[PDB]
Amino acid sequence: MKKVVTVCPYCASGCKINLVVDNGKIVRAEAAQGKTNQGTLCLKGYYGWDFINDTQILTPRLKTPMIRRQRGGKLEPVSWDEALNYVAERLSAIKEKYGPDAIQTTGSSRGTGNETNYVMQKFARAVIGTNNVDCCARVXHGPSVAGLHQSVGNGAMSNAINEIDNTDLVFVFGYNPADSHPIVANHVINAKRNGAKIIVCDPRKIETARIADMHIALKNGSNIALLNAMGHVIIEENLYDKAFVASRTEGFEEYRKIVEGYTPESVEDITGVSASEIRQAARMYAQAKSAAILWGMGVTQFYQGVETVRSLTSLAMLTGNLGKPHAGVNPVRGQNNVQGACDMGALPDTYPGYQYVKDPANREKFAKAWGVESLPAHTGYRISELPHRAAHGEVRAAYIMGEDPLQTDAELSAVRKAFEDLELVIVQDIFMTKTASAADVILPSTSWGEHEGVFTAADRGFQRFFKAVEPKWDLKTDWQIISEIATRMGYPMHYNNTQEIWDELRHLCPDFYGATYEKMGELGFIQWPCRDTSDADQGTSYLFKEKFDTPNGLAQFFTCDWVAPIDKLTDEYPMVLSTVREVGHYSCRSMTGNCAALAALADEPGYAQINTEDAKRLGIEDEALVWVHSRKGKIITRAQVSDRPNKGAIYMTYQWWIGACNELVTENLSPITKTPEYKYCAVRVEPIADQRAAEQYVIDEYNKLKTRLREAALA
Ligand SMILES: Nc1nc2c(c(=O)[nH]1)N[C@H]1C(S)=C(S)[C@@H](COP(=O)(O)OP(=O)(O)OC[C@H]3O[C@@H](n4cnc5c(=O)[nH]c(N)nc54)[C@H](O)[C@@H]3O)O[C@H]1N2
Ligand SMILES: Nc1nc2c(c(=O)[nH]1)N[C@H]1C(S)=C(S)[C@@H](COP(=O)(O)OP(=O)(O)OC[C@H]3O[C@@H](n4cnc5c(=O)[nH]c(N)nc54)[C@H](O)[C@@H]3O)O[C@H]1N2
Numbered sequence: 091m092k093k094v095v096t097v098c099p100y101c102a103s104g105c106k107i108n109l110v111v112d113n114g115k116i117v118r119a120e121a122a123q124g125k126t127n128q129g130t131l132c133l134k135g136y137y138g139w140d141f142i143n144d145t146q147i148l149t150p151r152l153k154t155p156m157i158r159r160q161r162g163g164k165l166e167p168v169s170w171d172e173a174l175n176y177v178a179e180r181l182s183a184i185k186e187k188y189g190p191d192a193i194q195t196t197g198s199s200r201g202t203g204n205e206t207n208y209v210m211q212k213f214a215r216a217v218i219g220t221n222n223v224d225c226c227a228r229v230x231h232g233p234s235v236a237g238l239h240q241s242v243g244n245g246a247m248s249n250a251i252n253e254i255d256n257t258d259l260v261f262v263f264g265y266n267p268a269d270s271h272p273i274v275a276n277h278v279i280n281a282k283r284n285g286a287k288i289i290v291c292d293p294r295k296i297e298t299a300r301i302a303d304m305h306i307a308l309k310n311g312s313n314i315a316l317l318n319a320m321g322h323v324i325i326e327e328n329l330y331d332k333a334f335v336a337s338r339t340e341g342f343e344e345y346r347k348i349v350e351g352y353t354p355e356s357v358e359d360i361t362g363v364s365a366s367e368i369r370q371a372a373r374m375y376a377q378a379k380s381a382a383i384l385w386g387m388g389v390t391q392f393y394q395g396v397e398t399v400r401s402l403t404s405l406a407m408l409t410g411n412l413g414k415p416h417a418g419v420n421p422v423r424g425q426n427n428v429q430g431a432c433d434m435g436a437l438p439d440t441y442p443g444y445q446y447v448k449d450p451a452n453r454e455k456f457a458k459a460w461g462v463e464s465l466p467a468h469t470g471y472r473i474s475e476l477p478h479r480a481a482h483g484e485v486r487a488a489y490i491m492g493e494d495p496l497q498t499d500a501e502l503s504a505v506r507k508a509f510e511d512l513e514l515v516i517v518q519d520i521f522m523t524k525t526a527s528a529a530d531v532i533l534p535s536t537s538w539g540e541h542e543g544v545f546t547a548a549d550r551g552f553q554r555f556f557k558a559v560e561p562k563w564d565l566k567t568d569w570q571i572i573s574e575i576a577t578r579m580g581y582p583m584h585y586n587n588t589q590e591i592w593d594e595l596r597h598l599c600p601d602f603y604g605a606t607y608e609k610m611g612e613l614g615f616i617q618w619p620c621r622d623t624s625d626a627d628q629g630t631s632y633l634f635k636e637k638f639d640t641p642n643g644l645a646q647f648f649t650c651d652w653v654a655p656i657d658k659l660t661d662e663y664p665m666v667l668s669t670v671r672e673v674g675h676y677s678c679r680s681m682t683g684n685c686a687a688l689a690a691l692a693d694e695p696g697y698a699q700i701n702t703e704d705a706k707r708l709g710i711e712d713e714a715l716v717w718v719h720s721r722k723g724k725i726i727t728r729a730q731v732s733d734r735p736n737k738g739a740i741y742m743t744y745q746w747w748i749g750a751c752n753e754l755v756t757e758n759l760s761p762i763t764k765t766p767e768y769k770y771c772a773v774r775v776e777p778i779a780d781q782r783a784a785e786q787y788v789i790d791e792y793n794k795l796k797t798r799l800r801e802a803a804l805a
């Protein structure tokens with residue numbers, strides 16, 4: 091019986107797991123002594139691995155390639171050679187006829203690893219000849235990287251996860267660690283335990299807030315109002331870092347101006363927070379010898395997102411909370427490998443190792459190495475513009491890999507039509523997901539326990555994950571399917587194992603070079619940049635120590651005027667719908683929902699956190715199927731009356747296939763990074779009278795979709 095070390099494929103906490111294999115099967119999971127977790131895991135890492143075994147509780151795992159030769163339906167299995175020639179032929183045709191930009195590809199932030207994300211960009215850029223590569227960063231912390239790129243020159247977690255434990259103040263802002271990154275929550279709690287203070291800036295009363303010295307329940311969509319007022323205080327009371335500011339920043343004056351306007355008192359109503367609280371919070375944050383900002387989607391997913399990020403970073407600049415351990419700016423990245431996909435270049439504007447295509451010196455390099463003449467220099471099409479490109483016929487095929495847009499994108503109807511507007515849609519997944527079912531050609535790959543590679547934790551930390559099991563079917567790794575189509579497309583590519591990819595990679599990215607496999611090892615956590623192979627170079631813990639990576643070394647101060655979300659509330663729909671997630675289930679729920687213990691604590695249709703006080707006045711009671719309509723749709727869910735959600739707004743998640751919250755979200759793509767404002771959706775929650783009839787609706791509807799996918803998978 092053996093133990094094969096791996097890294098959890100759920101959140102970006104990057105918990106090392108020991109998968110105990112017995113005979114030729116995974117028998118049980120158990121926390122390894124990784125850097126971030128140290129013997130601990132949450133319910134998912136512990137219970138969420140039996141999805142490898144094709145439970146079929148939700149969707150049967152993909153066993154064979156498929157092709158839908160006619161658009162009038164019928165996805166019938168076909169052999170590898172047949173699907174692989176079909177793709178290489180089609181993509182070839184679409185490329186000559188309409189140019190390389192006519193094709194869009196996507197990386198993957200889940201079980202593939204950094205290795206395949208790298209290969210995919212390489213394919214798009216060296217074989218198709220397009221910079222059209224993008225991953226979920228688009229929909230998640232895109233804002234985070236832009237604002238943080240301009241302000242501080244780096245969009246990654248400024249400091250380390252393992253570094254939280256010694257801050258003197260955890261400024262948690264619009265982010266729920268207890269539900270999103272449990273091991274990160276346990277680092278924050280640790281900090282509190284070690285005497286750090288804690289501030290939670292969330293409308294809702296998240297578990298986190300219960301342990302916090304201060305809960306600033308700001309009104310849904312008022313971040314800049316509160317943010318400016320804190321700066322107003324940090325400057326008014328001369329609480330800022332004069333020397334840090336003056337010597338390591340740019341833009342203090344112009345920033346100083348705006349905040350002067352925003353005074354605690356002029357905020358009261360917008361923030362819904364008392365000028366005092368605002369002062370006490372600014373006084374507090376500013377007063378901690380070392381205070382660190384952890385933030386998430388309660389920031390990024392508001393179109394004023396790039397601004398709020400840039401704004402928080404300002405407080406940190408203003409307080410010298412950067413360039414030192416246990417401080418900094420920390421957008422805790424979401425998916426297990428979302429950080430890594432960017433690190434590999436599954437972005438339409440950078441090569442792996444964060445070497446943008448605009449730079450010709452980089453192109454000279456990559457093209458030489460890939461044995462190519464020229465590598466595209468203009469930015470690719472961001473995946474979030476696909477339906478716009480698609481309708482416009484600017485894009486004609488999409489090679490969707492390791493993603494589920496048809497369930498996770500905003501305004502799902504749009505995605506649907508996008509698929510119906512594209513010439514060829516290629517889904518390369520591991521489960522017959524809602525998206526894979528609308529595919530033109532499906533290509534199955536190896537699940538997380540069936541292959542290996544590297545993943546990047548939320549804080550730039552590289553970690554190795556090893557193969558524990560053989561696939562039970564003819565499945566190629568994601569990098570073998572791509573390599574093989576490249577080759578059929580005339581560009582010769584074949585890799586013996588993931589490390590070969592990792593070393594080519596290392597030779598092309600000066601910051602990832604010292605991160606050798608030997609170095610990462612079984613329990614090593616190597617946060618880049620790791621320059622030399624020398625074991626003395628164990629990696630970069632916190633960033634911006636000497637300079638700021640900005641073109642002129644200084645951090646760039648910034649803010650703007652508060653601005654409300656798009657969807658305007660009407661007297662008829664006074665309720666604010668703010669999407670979020672739940673513990674126990676993870677994102678598209680294909681893995682998680684197909685796990686026996688997890689499926690058992692939550693199935694269809696999902697919950698809506700409705701506020702106590704106002705639910706009583708709504709005729710809605712705990713556990714009743716209710717409705718929520720929207721300009722984008724009308725979803726049914728199970729209510730859950732409680733005193734946690736903020737009276738006025740409700741909260742729903744995007745993990746359920748039936749009560750699909752996303753079904754009603756308008757994509758108010760941030761002008762900048764093109765990001766959806768999933769945290770603000772104007773909704774109407776009308777109670778359901780005949781529950782018995784509703785309980786059958788949920789059932790019937792669910793059963794319909796599950797049989798739907800099931801047939802298609804096993805047909
Ligand atoms: N259990 C589990 N964990 C996950 C996931 C999952 O599916 N399941 N998904 C993972 C992924 S992909 C991601 S990106 C992370 C995201 O994890 P988080 O960053 O925690 O994101 P959310 O939970 O979507 O929302 C964060 C908080 O912002 C708050 N918020 C809403 N509006 C505002 C506002 O106007 N101001 C402020 N300050 N806050 C506001 C919301 O109330 C919510 O509590 O979760 C990851 N971890
Ligand atoms: N309402 C609302 N919507 C949201 C959000 C929100 O907060 N509110 N959050 C948004 C955010 S932050 C994110 S990250 C998106 C999530 O973006 P999604 O695309 O939903 O991410 P997942 O849900 O992980 O989907 C991953 C897919 O990868 C497949 N897969 C797993 N391992 C492999 C592999 O190794 N190879 C291949 N070929 N496929 C594999 C899985 O079976 C699944 O089909 O959701 C977003 N949608």
Ligand code: SF4
Pocket residue numbers: 098099100101102103104105127130131132133134135136271272273274
């Ligand atoms: S879901 Fe996260 S906190 Fe949980 S075990 Fe996985 S990596 Fe760790």
Ligand SMILES: O=N[O-]
Pocket residue numbers: 226227228229230231232423424425428
């Ligand atoms: O961008 N984080 O999922």
Ligand SMILES: [Mo+6]
Pocket residue numbers: 226229230231424425428
């Ligand atoms: Mo995310």
